[PDB]
């Protein structure tokens, strides 16, 4: 489950 | 004399204004791709060759997976800023 | 004649700043997976020949001081310098665990007039961090 | 799928924040450096090799000639921003 | 393979915007020497094989319109596209004769989702213009 | 005498 910075 | 800003290189994970994506189980897209290319070719390709292959790998191999559809299947391209004055090999 | 000279004793120094955990007052969440990044970057840049040191959950003042001090070391026997920043970020700016600091301030310590022993040598900055909130929807 | 921002390259004459210098008789420093490198090598060098040599030539060969000494003996370094995903040869 | 495929009927279009004269109200002066730049660029880029087009003293609306129209042409049989901008500038921005326009808005016309016939092909922008007011004093 | 843009 991708996230961003 | 020589410009005080010369001989810097910035390898950004993304383009100005944009998100940078990270997989919690595998790491950020940019770093995954950067380490891939460095293991195979860190010692025989020039820095701009390495980072161009990284650009291609991030652009093609990765697509965001998300619950929110606002963030479903999004893409990323990194961004190299070079003030280098010579080619750079690590050897 | 068209390559950076690499005939030095050391490849150079590589500083990895690995910011995973942020103060409550910043509102930023934990960057899961960034330890996997840092260890993979550690092996790669070490394999290249860099003398690598990782610094974890740095504050803005520590990041500034780490890079100011590295800039003041003697690089006569080094071919180049690298720094890797893993954190939250926004355009032109990177998060310490206690706020934002401008990227230009981290890098300006290495300008030709402020670091004579890296003059005419590559200074490399690899930055994993957001630069805004635009999404690339892609296209087929 | 492909990022919408992929496969751009920006060859700026100068770094962000800085002046860019032009000579009224010979033209701007970046353009005359770029043209001279492309004439000798535009068909045999990769685009980043071309622009890295342009970086060197602007950085070493040019110094601002002015009489308001606030602008005497000033310097310039160009700035390449690459989102390319492959090597570029004009052949 | 690792190189852009260059096996196309034409190398591609090269658009040169040569802005020398500016409306008084903008405060900007005549850019002496830019005609020599434009001449040497079109000879050079013609040698490479580009179809070169030189525009002169363009308004902001002309610069947007001609780049938007160029992104609507059929580039199917071209290998790449190139644009060269010669003008006054400040950070992120370039002057037409009647004011200032964001560089990003000029180049966005060629995004993958807005110029489908240059998809996966290199889109080159060469920009001669200031990006601010800092001087580089140098070091010997 | 050089200028800038």
CSV table of C-alpha atoms in Angstrom, one decimal:
chain,number,residue,atom,x,y,z
A,1,UNK,CA,0.0,0.0,0.0
A,2,UNK,CA,2.0,3.0,-1.4
A,3,UNK,CA,2.6,6.4,0.5
A,4,UNK,CA,4.2,9.4,-0.5
A,5,UNK,CA,6.9,11.6,1.1
B,1,UNK,CA,38.5,31.4,-11.9
B,2,UNK,CA,35.8,28.8,-11.6
B,3,UNK,CA,32.1,29.3,-10.7
B,4,UNK,CA,31.2,28.6,-7.1
B,5,UNK,CA,28.1,26.7,-8.2
B,6,UNK,CA,30.0,24.4,-10.6
B,7,UNK,CA,30.4,20.6,-10.2
B,8,UNK,CA,27.2,19.9,-8.3
B,9,UNK,CA,24.7,17.2,-9.3
B,10,UNK,CA,21.3,16.7,-7.8
B,11,UNK,CA,19.5,13.4,-8.4
B,12,UNK,CA,16.0,14.1,-7.3
B,13,UNK,CA,13.5,11.3,-6.9
B,14,UNK,CA,10.7,13.3,-8.7
B,15,UNK,CA,10.1,16.4,-10.8
B,16,UNK,CA,9.3,19.8,-9.2
B,17,UNK,CA,5.8,20.1,-7.8
B,18,UNK,CA,5.1,16.3,-7.7
B,19,UNK,CA,4.8,13.5,-5.2
B,20,UNK,CA,7.5,10.9,-4.6
B,21,UNK,CA,6.3,7.4,-4.0
B,22,UNK,CA,7.4,4.8,-1.4
B,23,UNK,CA,6.4,1.1,-0.8
B,24,UNK,CA,6.4,0.3,2.9
B,25,UNK,CA,7.5,-3.2,2.3
B,26,UNK,CA,10.2,-2.6,-0.4
B,27,UNK,CA,11.3,1.1,0.0
B,28,UNK,CA,10.9,4.2,-2.2
B,29,UNK,CA,10.6,3.7,-6.0
B,30,UNK,CA,13.6,5.9,-6.7
B,31,UNK,CA,16.0,4.1,-4.3
B,32,UNK,CA,14.9,0.7,-5.3
B,33,UNK,CA,15.7,1.6,-8.9
B,34,UNK,CA,18.9,3.4,-8.0
B,35,UNK,CA,20.3,0.5,-6.1
B,36,UNK,CA,19.3,-1.9,-8.9
B,37,UNK,CA,21.3,0.0,-11.4
B,38,UNK,CA,24.3,0.6,-9.1
B,39,UNK,CA,24.6,-3.1,-8.3
B,40,UNK,CA,24.8,-4.1,-12.0
B,41,UNK,CA,26.5,-1.1,-13.5
B,42,UNK,CA,27.9,1.3,-10.8
B,43,UNK,CA,31.5,0.7,-11.9
B,44,UNK,CA,31.3,0.6,-15.7
B,45,UNK,CA,28.7,3.3,-16.7
B,46,UNK,CA,29.0,7.1,-16.5
B,47,UNK,CA,26.9,8.9,-13.8
B,48,UNK,CA,24.4,10.3,-16.4
B,49,UNK,CA,24.0,6.8,-17.9
B,50,UNK,CA,23.3,5.3,-14.5
B,51,UNK,CA,20.7,8.0,-13.7
B,52,UNK,CA,19.1,7.8,-17.1
B,53,UNK,CA,18.5,4.1,-16.7
B,54,UNK,CA,17.1,4.9,-13.2
B,55,UNK,CA,14.7,7.4,-14.8
B,56,UNK,CA,13.5,4.7,-17.2
B,57,UNK,CA,13.1,2.1,-14.5
B,58,UNK,CA,11.1,4.4,-12.2
B,59,UNK,CA,9.0,5.5,-15.2
B,60,UNK,CA,8.2,2.0,-16.5
B,61,UNK,CA,8.4,-0.5,-13.6
B,62,UNK,CA,6.3,1.3,-10.9
B,63,UNK,CA,2.6,2.1,-10.5
B,64,UNK,CA,1.0,3.2,-7.3
B,65,UNK,CA,-1.5,0.9,-5.5
B,66,UNK,CA,-3.9,2.6,-3.2
B,67,UNK,CA,-7.3,2.3,-1.5
B,68,UNK,CA,-8.2,5.9,-2.4
B,69,UNK,CA,-8.9,6.1,-6.2
B,70,UNK,CA,-7.5,9.7,-6.2
B,71,UNK,CA,-4.1,7.9,-5.7
B,72,UNK,CA,-4.7,4.7,-7.7
B,73,UNK,CA,-2.3,3.8,-10.5
B,74,UNK,CA,-0.2,7.0,-10.4
B,75,UNK,CA,3.2,7.3,-12.0
B,76,UNK,CA,6.6,9.0,-11.3
B,77,UNK,CA,9.6,10.3,-13.2
B,78,UNK,CA,12.8,11.3,-11.4
B,79,UNK,CA,14.7,14.5,-12.2
B,80,UNK,CA,18.5,14.9,-12.6
B,81,UNK,CA,20.0,18.4,-12.3
B,82,UNK,CA,23.6,18.5,-13.5
B,83,UNK,CA,26.2,21.3,-13.1
B,84,UNK,CA,28.9,18.8,-13.7
B,85,UNK,CA,31.8,19.9,-16.0
B,86,UNK,CA,33.2,16.4,-16.8
B,87,UNK,CA,32.1,12.8,-17.1
B,88,UNK,CA,32.1,10.8,-13.9
B,89,UNK,CA,32.9,7.1,-13.5
B,90,UNK,CA,33.3,5.4,-10.1
B,91,UNK,CA,36.7,3.7,-10.9
C,1,UNK,CA,40.7,14.9,-20.5
C,2,UNK,CA,36.9,14.6,-20.3
C,3,UNK,CA,36.6,12.7,-17.1
C,4,UNK,CA,36.8,13.8,-13.5
C,5,UNK,CA,40.2,12.7,-12.1
C,6,UNK,CA,39.7,9.7,-9.9
C,7,UNK,CA,43.3,9.0,-8.9
C,8,UNK,CA,43.0,9.8,-5.2
C,9,UNK,CA,43.4,7.6,-2.1
C,10,UNK,CA,39.7,7.7,-1.2
C,11,UNK,CA,36.6,7.7,-3.4
C,12,UNK,CA,35.2,10.1,-0.9
C,13,UNK,CA,32.7,10.6,2.0
C,14,UNK,CA,29.0,9.6,1.7
C,15,UNK,CA,26.5,11.0,4.2
C,16,UNK,CA,23.1,9.3,4.3
C,17,UNK,CA,20.5,11.1,6.4
C,18,UNK,CA,17.7,8.6,7.1
C,19,UNK,CA,14.6,10.3,8.6
C,20,UNK,CA,11.9,7.8,9.5
C,21,UNK,CA,10.2,9.2,12.7
C,22,UNK,CA,9.0,12.8,13.0
C,23,UNK,CA,8.0,14.9,16.0
C,24,UNK,CA,4.3,15.2,16.8
C,25,UNK,CA,4.4,18.9,16.2
C,26,UNK,CA,5.3,18.5,12.5
C,27,UNK,CA,2.3,16.3,11.8
C,28,UNK,CA,4.3,13.9,9.5
C,29,UNK,CA,3.8,10.2,9.7
C,30,UNK,CA,6.4,7.4,9.9
C,31,UNK,CA,8.2,6.6,6.7
C,32,UNK,CA,7.9,2.9,6.6
C,33,UNK,CA,10.4,1.2,4.3
C,34,UNK,CA,13.0,3.9,4.6
C,35,UNK,CA,15.3,1.6,6.6
C,36,UNK,CA,15.2,-0.8,3.7
C,37,UNK,CA,16.3,2.1,1.5
C,38,UNK,CA,19.1,3.2,3.8
C,39,UNK,CA,20.6,-0.2,4.2
C,40,UNK,CA,20.5,-0.9,0.4
C,41,UNK,CA,22.0,2.5,-0.2
C,42,UNK,CA,24.6,1.7,2.4
C,43,UNK,CA,25.7,-1.4,0.6
C,44,UNK,CA,25.7,0.2,-2.8
C,45,UNK,CA,27.6,3.3,-2.0
C,46,UNK,CA,30.0,1.3,0.1
C,47,UNK,CA,30.6,-1.1,-2.8
C,48,UNK,CA,31.3,1.9,-5.0
C,49,UNK,CA,34.1,2.8,-2.5
C,50,UNK,CA,32.5,5.6,-0.5
C,51,UNK,CA,33.2,5.9,3.2
C,52,UNK,CA,29.5,5.8,4.2
C,53,UNK,CA,27.9,6.9,7.5
C,54,UNK,CA,24.1,6.8,8.2
C,55,UNK,CA,22.5,9.3,10.6
C,56,UNK,CA,19.0,8.6,11.8
C,57,UNK,CA,16.0,10.9,12.6
C,58,UNK,CA,18.1,14.1,12.3
C,59,UNK,CA,16.8,17.5,13.4
C,60,UNK,CA,17.1,20.5,11.1
C,61,UNK,CA,20.1,21.8,13.1
C,62,UNK,CA,21.8,18.4,13.1
C,63,UNK,CA,21.4,18.1,9.3
C,64,UNK,CA,22.8,21.6,8.9
C,65,UNK,CA,25.7,20.9,11.3
C,66,UNK,CA,26.5,17.5,9.8
C,67,UNK,CA,26.8,19.0,6.3
C,68,UNK,CA,28.6,22.1,7.5
C,69,UNK,CA,31.2,20.0,9.3
C,70,UNK,CA,31.7,17.6,6.4
C,71,UNK,CA,32.2,20.6,4.3
C,72,UNK,CA,35.0,21.8,6.7
C,73,UNK,CA,36.9,18.4,6.7
C,74,UNK,CA,39.9,18.0,4.4
C,75,UNK,CA,39.1,16.3,1.1
C,76,UNK,CA,42.5,16.7,-0.5
C,77,UNK,CA,42.8,12.9,-0.8
C,78,UNK,CA,39.2,12.4,-1.9
C,79,UNK,CA,37.8,12.2,-5.5
C,80,UNK,CA,34.3,13.5,-4.6
C,81,UNK,CA,31.5,13.9,-2.0
C,82,UNK,CA,28.0,12.4,-1.9
C,83,UNK,CA,25.1,13.0,0.4
C,84,UNK,CA,21.7,11.1,0.4
C,85,UNK,CA,18.6,12.7,1.9
C,86,UNK,CA,15.7,10.4,2.8
C,87,UNK,CA,12.8,12.3,4.3
C,88,UNK,CA,9.4,14.0,3.8
C,89,UNK,CA,9.7,17.1,1.8
C,90,UNK,CA,8.2,20.0,-0.2
C,91,UNK,CA,9.5,22.0,-3.1
C,92,UNK,CA,13.1,23.4,-2.3
C,93,UNK,CA,12.8,22.1,1.3
C,94,UNK,CA,13.4,18.9,3.3
C,95,UNK,CA,12.0,17.8,6.7
C,96,UNK,CA,14.2,17.3,9.7
C,97,UNK,CA,12.3,15.5,12.4
C,98,UNK,CA,11.5,19.0,13.9
C,99,UNK,CA,10.5,21.0,10.9
C,100,UNK,CA,11.6,22.0,7.4
C,101,UNK,CA,15.0,23.3,6.2
C,102,UNK,CA,15.9,24.6,2.7
C,103,UNK,CA,17.8,22.2,0.5
C,104,UNK,CA,20.0,25.0,-0.8
C,105,UNK,CA,21.2,25.6,2.7
C,106,UNK,CA,22.4,22.0,3.1
C,107,UNK,CA,24.3,22.1,-0.2
C,108,UNK,CA,25.7,25.7,-0.2
C,109,UNK,CA,28.4,24.6,2.3
C,110,UNK,CA,30.0,22.8,-0.6
C,111,UNK,CA,30.2,25.8,-3.0
C,112,UNK,CA,33.6,26.4,-4.6
C,113,UNK,CA,34.3,29.4,-2.4
C,114,UNK,CA,33.3,27.5,0.8
C,115,UNK,CA,35.1,24.2,0.4
C,116,UNK,CA,38.4,24.5,-1.4
C,117,UNK,CA,39.4,20.8,-1.1
C,118,UNK,CA,36.4,19.8,-3.1
C,119,UNK,CA,36.9,22.5,-5.8
C,120,UNK,CA,36.6,21.0,-9.3
C,121,UNK,CA,35.4,17.7,-7.8
C,122,UNK,CA,31.9,16.3,-8.1
C,123,UNK,CA,29.5,17.0,-5.2
C,124,UNK,CA,26.5,14.7,-5.5
C,125,UNK,CA,23.1,15.0,-3.8
C,126,UNK,CA,20.5,12.2,-4.0
C,127,UNK,CA,17.2,13.4,-2.7
C,128,UNK,CA,14.2,11.1,-1.9
C,129,UNK,CA,11.4,13.4,-0.9
C,130,UNK,CA,8.2,15.1,-2.3
C,131,UNK,CA,8.5,18.4,-4.2
C,132,UNK,CA,4.8,19.2,-4.1
C,133,UNK,CA,1.3,17.7,-4.3
C,134,UNK,CA,0.8,17.2,-8.1
C,135,UNK,CA,0.0,13.7,-9.3
C,136,UNK,CA,1.3,12.2,-12.5
C,137,UNK,CA,-1.7,10.3,-13.9
C,138,UNK,CA,0.4,8.7,-16.6
C,139,UNK,CA,-0.6,7.8,-20.1
C,140,UNK,CA,-0.5,4.6,-22.2
D,1,UNK,CA,1.6,3.5,-18.9
D,2,UNK,CA,4.2,6.3,-19.1
D,3,UNK,CA,4.6,9.4,-16.8
D,4,UNK,CA,3.2,12.5,-18.5
D,5,UNK,CA,6.4,14.4,-17.5
D,6,UNK,CA,8.9,11.8,-18.9
D,7,UNK,CA,11.3,12.4,-21.7
D,8,UNK,CA,11.9,16.2,-21.3
D,9,UNK,CA,15.3,17.8,-21.1
D,10,UNK,CA,15.8,21.4,-20.1
D,11,UNK,CA,19.2,22.9,-21.0
D,12,UNK,CA,19.2,26.2,-19.0
D,13,UNK,CA,22.0,28.7,-19.6
D,14,UNK,CA,22.3,29.3,-15.8
D,15,UNK,CA,21.5,27.8,-12.4
D,16,UNK,CA,18.3,28.9,-10.6
D,17,UNK,CA,18.6,32.3,-8.9
D,18,UNK,CA,21.5,33.5,-11.1
D,19,UNK,CA,22.2,36.0,-13.8
D,20,UNK,CA,22.9,34.8,-17.4
D,21,UNK,CA,25.5,36.7,-19.4
D,22,UNK,CA,25.5,37.8,-23.0
D,23,UNK,CA,28.1,39.6,-25.0
D,24,UNK,CA,26.7,42.1,-27.6
D,25,UNK,CA,29.3,41.3,-30.2
D,26,UNK,CA,29.6,37.5,-29.9
D,27,UNK,CA,26.3,36.5,-28.4
D,28,UNK,CA,25.4,34.9,-25.1
D,29,UNK,CA,28.0,32.7,-23.5
D,30,UNK,CA,25.8,29.6,-23.3
D,31,UNK,CA,24.7,29.8,-26.9
D,32,UNK,CA,28.2,30.3,-28.4
D,33,UNK,CA,29.5,27.5,-26.2
D,34,UNK,CA,26.6,25.2,-27.2
D,35,UNK,CA,27.0,26.0,-30.9
D,36,UNK,CA,30.7,25.4,-31.0
D,37,UNK,CA,30.4,22.1,-29.2
D,38,UNK,CA,27.6,21.0,-31.5
D,39,UNK,CA,29.5,21.9,-34.6
D,40,UNK,CA,32.5,19.6,-33.6
D,41,UNK,CA,30.6,16.9,-31.9
D,42,UNK,CA,26.8,17.1,-32.4
D,43,UNK,CA,26.7,14.0,-34.5
D,44,UNK,CA,29.0,11.8,-32.4
D,45,UNK,CA,28.4,12.6,-28.7
D,46,UNK,CA,25.4,11.8,-26.4
D,47,UNK,CA,23.3,14.8,-25.5
D,48,UNK,CA,24.6,14.8,-21.9
D,49,UNK,CA,28.1,14.5,-23.0
D,50,UNK,CA,27.5,17.5,-25.3
D,51,UNK,CA,25.9,19.5,-22.5
D,52,UNK,CA,28.6,18.5,-19.9
D,53,UNK,CA,31.2,20.0,-22.3
D,54,UNK,CA,29.1,23.1,-22.7
D,55,UNK,CA,29.0,23.3,-18.9
D,56,UNK,CA,32.8,23.1,-18.8
D,57,UNK,CA,33.3,25.7,-21.6
D,58,UNK,CA,31.0,28.3,-20.1
D,59,UNK,CA,32.5,27.7,-16.7
D,60,UNK,CA,36.2,28.0,-17.7
D,61,UNK,CA,36.3,30.2,-20.8
D,62,UNK,CA,34.0,33.1,-19.9
D,63,UNK,CA,34.4,36.0,-17.4
D,64,UNK,CA,32.2,39.1,-17.3
D,65,UNK,CA,34.0,42.2,-18.8
D,66,UNK,CA,32.4,45.2,-17.2
D,67,UNK,CA,33.3,48.6,-15.9
D,68,UNK,CA,30.8,49.0,-13.1
D,69,UNK,CA,33.1,46.9,-10.9
D,70,UNK,CA,30.0,45.3,-9.2
D,71,UNK,CA,29.9,43.1,-12.4
D,72,UNK,CA,33.7,42.8,-13.0
D,73,UNK,CA,35.2,39.3,-13.6
D,74,UNK,CA,31.9,37.4,-12.8
D,75,UNK,CA,31.3,33.8,-13.7
D,76,UNK,CA,28.5,31.4,-15.0
D,77,UNK,CA,27.6,27.7,-14.9
D,78,UNK,CA,24.8,26.3,-17.0
D,79,UNK,CA,22.2,23.8,-15.7
D,80,UNK,CA,20.9,20.6,-17.3
D,81,UNK,CA,17.6,19.1,-16.0
D,82,UNK,CA,17.0,15.7,-17.5
D,83,UNK,CA,13.9,13.6,-17.4
D,84,UNK,CA,15.2,11.5,-20.4
D,85,UNK,CA,14.8,7.7,-20.2
D,86,UNK,CA,17.3,6.7,-22.9
D,87,UNK,CA,20.5,8.0,-24.3
D,88,UNK,CA,20.1,10.6,-27.1
D,89,UNK,CA,22.2,10.5,-30.2
D,90,UNK,CA,21.4,12.8,-33.2
D,91,UNK,CA,22.0,9.8,-35.6
E,1,UNK,CA,18.1,-1.2,-26.1
E,2,UNK,CA,19.3,1.9,-24.2
E,3,UNK,CA,19.0,4.7,-26.8
E,4,UNK,CA,16.1,6.7,-28.2
E,5,UNK,CA,15.1,5.2,-31.5
E,6,UNK,CA,16.2,7.6,-34.2
E,7,UNK,CA,14.9,5.6,-37.2
E,8,UNK,CA,12.2,8.1,-38.4
E,9,UNK,CA,11.6,10.0,-41.6
E,10,UNK,CA,12.8,13.2,-40.0
E,11,UNK,CA,14.9,14.2,-37.0
E,12,UNK,CA,12.1,16.6,-36.0
E,13,UNK,CA,11.1,20.3,-35.6
E,14,UNK,CA,13.3,22.9,-34.1
E,15,UNK,CA,11.5,26.1,-33.0
E,16,UNK,CA,13.6,29.1,-32.1
E,17,UNK,CA,12.1,32.1,-30.3
E,18,UNK,CA,14.4,35.1,-30.7
E,19,UNK,CA,13.1,37.9,-28.5
E,20,UNK,CA,15.3,41.1,-28.9
E,21,UNK,CA,12.9,44.0,-28.5
E,22,UNK,CA,10.5,44.6,-25.6
E,23,UNK,CA,7.6,47.0,-25.0
E,24,UNK,CA,8.8,50.0,-23.0
E,25,UNK,CA,6.4,49.3,-20.1
E,26,UNK,CA,8.1,46.0,-19.3
E,27,UNK,CA,11.3,47.9,-18.3
E,28,UNK,CA,13.4,45.5,-20.5
E,29,UNK,CA,16.1,46.7,-22.9
E,30,UNK,CA,17.2,45.6,-26.4
E,31,UNK,CA,19.1,42.2,-26.2
E,32,UNK,CA,22.1,43.1,-28.3
E,33,UNK,CA,23.9,40.0,-29.6
E,34,UNK,CA,20.8,37.8,-29.7
E,35,UNK,CA,20.5,37.9,-33.6
E,36,UNK,CA,24.0,36.3,-33.7
E,37,UNK,CA,22.7,33.6,-31.3
E,38,UNK,CA,19.6,32.9,-33.4
E,39,UNK,CA,21.7,32.7,-36.6
E,40,UNK,CA,24.3,30.4,-35.1
E,41,UNK,CA,21.6,28.2,-33.6
E,42,UNK,CA,19.6,27.8,-36.8
E,43,UNK,CA,22.7,27.0,-38.8
E,44,UNK,CA,23.8,24.5,-36.1
E,45,UNK,CA,20.4,22.8,-35.7
E,46,UNK,CA,19.9,22.7,-39.5
E,47,UNK,CA,23.2,20.8,-39.8
E,48,UNK,CA,21.9,18.3,-37.2
E,49,UNK,CA,18.8,17.7,-39.5
E,50,UNK,CA,16.1,19.6,-37.7
E,51,UNK,CA,13.4,21.6,-39.6
E,52,UNK,CA,14.3,24.9,-38.1
E,53,UNK,CA,11.8,27.8,-37.7
E,54,UNK,CA,12.9,31.1,-36.3
E,55,UNK,CA,10.3,33.4,-34.6
E,56,UNK,CA,11.2,37.0,-33.6
E,57,UNK,CA,9.9,39.5,-30.9
E,58,UNK,CA,7.0,37.4,-29.8
E,59,UNK,CA,4.3,38.4,-27.4
E,60,UNK,CA,3.5,36.2,-24.5
E,61,UNK,CA,0.3,35.1,-26.2
E,62,UNK,CA,2.2,34.4,-29.4
E,63,UNK,CA,4.7,32.3,-27.5
E,64,UNK,CA,1.9,30.2,-25.9
E,65,UNK,CA,-0.1,29.9,-29.2
E,66,UNK,CA,2.8,28.8,-31.4
E,67,UNK,CA,4.0,26.2,-28.9
E,68,UNK,CA,0.4,25.0,-28.3
E,69,UNK,CA,-0.1,24.7,-32.1
E,70,UNK,CA,3.3,22.9,-32.5
E,71,UNK,CA,2.1,20.3,-29.9
E,72,UNK,CA,-1.0,19.7,-32.0
E,73,UNK,CA,0.9,18.9,-35.1
E,74,UNK,CA,1.5,15.3,-36.2
E,75,UNK,CA,4.9,14.3,-35.0
E,76,UNK,CA,4.4,10.6,-35.8
E,77,UNK,CA,7.3,10.5,-38.3
E,78,UNK,CA,9.7,12.7,-36.2
E,79,UNK,CA,12.3,11.3,-33.7
E,80,UNK,CA,12.2,14.3,-31.3
E,81,UNK,CA,11.3,17.9,-30.8
E,82,UNK,CA,13.5,20.9,-29.9
E,83,UNK,CA,12.7,24.5,-28.7
E,84,UNK,CA,15.1,27.2,-28.0
E,85,UNK,CA,14.2,30.3,-26.1
E,86,UNK,CA,16.2,33.6,-26.2
E,87,UNK,CA,14.9,36.4,-24.0
E,88,UNK,CA,15.0,38.2,-20.7
E,89,UNK,CA,13.9,36.0,-17.8
E,90,UNK,CA,13.5,35.7,-14.1
E,91,UNK,CA,13.1,32.5,-12.0
E,92,UNK,CA,10.6,30.1,-13.6
E,93,UNK,CA,9.6,32.7,-16.1
E,94,UNK,CA,10.4,34.1,-19.5
E,95,UNK,CA,9.7,37.4,-21.2
E,96,UNK,CA,7.6,37.9,-24.2
E,97,UNK,CA,7.7,41.5,-25.5
E,98,UNK,CA,4.7,42.5,-23.5
E,99,UNK,CA,5.4,40.8,-20.2
E,100,UNK,CA,6.2,37.5,-18.5
E,101,UNK,CA,5.0,33.9,-18.9
E,102,UNK,CA,5.8,30.8,-16.9
E,103,UNK,CA,8.3,28.4,-18.6
E,104,UNK,CA,6.3,25.5,-17.3
E,105,UNK,CA,3.2,26.6,-19.1
E,106,UNK,CA,5.2,26.8,-22.4
E,107,UNK,CA,6.5,23.3,-22.0
E,108,UNK,CA,3.4,21.6,-20.6
E,109,UNK,CA,1.8,21.6,-24.1
E,110,UNK,CA,4.2,18.7,-24.9
E,111,UNK,CA,3.3,16.5,-21.9
E,112,UNK,CA,2.6,12.9,-22.7
E,113,UNK,CA,-1.1,13.3,-22.2
E,114,UNK,CA,-1.3,16.5,-24.4
E,115,UNK,CA,1.0,15.6,-27.3
E,116,UNK,CA,0.5,11.9,-27.9
E,117,UNK,CA,2.6,11.9,-31.1
E,118,UNK,CA,5.8,12.8,-29.1
E,119,UNK,CA,5.1,10.2,-26.4
E,120,UNK,CA,8.3,8.4,-25.5
E,121,UNK,CA,10.3,10.8,-27.6
E,122,UNK,CA,12.8,13.4,-26.3
E,123,UNK,CA,11.4,16.9,-26.0
E,124,UNK,CA,14.3,19.4,-25.7
E,125,UNK,CA,14.2,22.9,-24.4
E,126,UNK,CA,17.3,25.2,-24.5
E,127,UNK,CA,16.8,28.4,-22.5
E,128,UNK,CA,19.0,31.5,-22.6
E,129,UNK,CA,17.6,33.8,-20.0
E,130,UNK,CA,18.4,34.9,-16.4
E,131,UNK,CA,16.8,33.0,-13.5
E,132,UNK,CA,17.3,35.7,-10.9
E,133,UNK,CA,19.8,38.3,-9.8
E,134,UNK,CA,22.6,36.5,-8.0
E,135,UNK,CA,26.1,36.9,-9.3
E,136,UNK,CA,28.7,34.1,-9.3
E,137,UNK,CA,32.0,35.7,-8.2
E,138,UNK,CA,34.1,32.5,-8.8
E,139,UNK,CA,37.3,31.1,-7.3
E,140,UNK,CA,40.7,30.7,-8.9
F,1,UNK,CA,30.9,45.2,-22.1
F,2,UNK,CA,28.9,42.0,-21.3
F,3,UNK,CA,25.1,42.2,-20.2
F,4,UNK,CA,22.7,40.0,-18.6
F,5,UNK,CA,19.3,38.6,-19.5
